[PDB]
From a paper:
Prokaryotic cell envelopes often include proteinaceous surface (S-) layers composed of self-assembling subunits in porous two-dimensional crystalline lattices. S-layer anchoring is best characterized for Gram-positive bacteria, where S-layer proteins non-covalently attach to the PG layer via species- and strain-specific non-classical secondary cell wall polymers (SCWPs). SpaA possesses three consecutive SLH domains near its N-terminus, followed by a large C-terminal region presumed to harbor the self-assembling domain(s). The crystal structures and binding analyses presented here of P. alvei SpaASLH, SpaASLH/G109A, and SpaASLH/G46A/G109A with synthetic SCWP fragments provide novel insights into the functional contributions of many conserved SLH domain residues, including SLH-Trp13, SLH-Gly29, and SLH-Arg43, which precisely interlock from three different SLH domains to generate two active binding sites.
Here we report crystal structures of the SLH domains of SpaA, unliganded and in complex with synthesized monosaccharide and disaccharide building blocks of P. alvei CCM 2051T SCWP. The TRAE, TVEE, and TRAQ motifs of SpaA are located at the N-termini of the core helices adjacent to three grooves (labeled here G1, G2, and G3). The TRAE and TRAQ motifs each contribute to two of the three grooves, as their arginine residues thread under the connecting loops of the adjacent SLH domains and into the neighboring grooves. In the case of SLH2, Val125 of the TVEE motif corresponds in position to the conserved SLH-Arg43 of the TRAE and TRAQ motifs but does not protrude into the neighboring G3. In the initial liganded and unliganded structures, multiple conformations were observed for residues 44–54 that form the connecting loop between the two helices of SLH1 beside G1. The loop makes unique crystal contacts in each case and has mean B-factors elevated between 4 and 49% of the molecule mean. In both G1 and G2, the non-conserved SLH-28 residue is observed to make a hydrogen bond from its backbone carbonyl to the side chain of the conserved SLH-Arg43 of the TRAE motif. The hydrogen bond between the SLH-28 backbone carbonyl and SLH-Arg43 in the unliganded state may support the proper folding of the SLH domain trimer, as these residues precisely interlock between neighboring SLH domains.
Author numbering: 28 to 191
The structure:
Amino acid sequence: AKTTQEKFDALKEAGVFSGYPGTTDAKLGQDMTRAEFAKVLVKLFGLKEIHGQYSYKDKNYDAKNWAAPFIEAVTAEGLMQGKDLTKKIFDFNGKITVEEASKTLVTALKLEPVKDAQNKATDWAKGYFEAAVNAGLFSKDANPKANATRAQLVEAAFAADEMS
Ligand SMILES: [Cl-]
Ligand SMILES: [Cl-]
């Protein structure tokens, strides 16, 4: 049984997660931005970065934003969409949620959302969260609406990698 720390160390070795300067602390209790999570997905699934395309209207979403090539890759791949679709806002500094991460991973693994799933997720996500739980990516007792912890994302990424 690998611990969350051992799963993180393996993912860091692989270039999927990064740690922090000066310490071996992986901050497993802390949160992750949507920009960072798009980079995680690009590394985890070996996606091509997309330069010189900008699908969203967020302020400071341009060539000087380090995250755009990753955000564009997960967008073209169908993994992430904006937080709001009429204004085309990605919310790159916003934190990724359990249920958002669930939808990305379920889609990337070509799994099927569960129809008429009953759980605490936002309506759009109930099926994705349920599919993610059933695949072992998140615990049934996780809060789907919460910001996902780095621990949770490590576990989910690790499991997804094994399924691929
Ligand atoms: Cl921590
Ligand atoms: Cl969990």
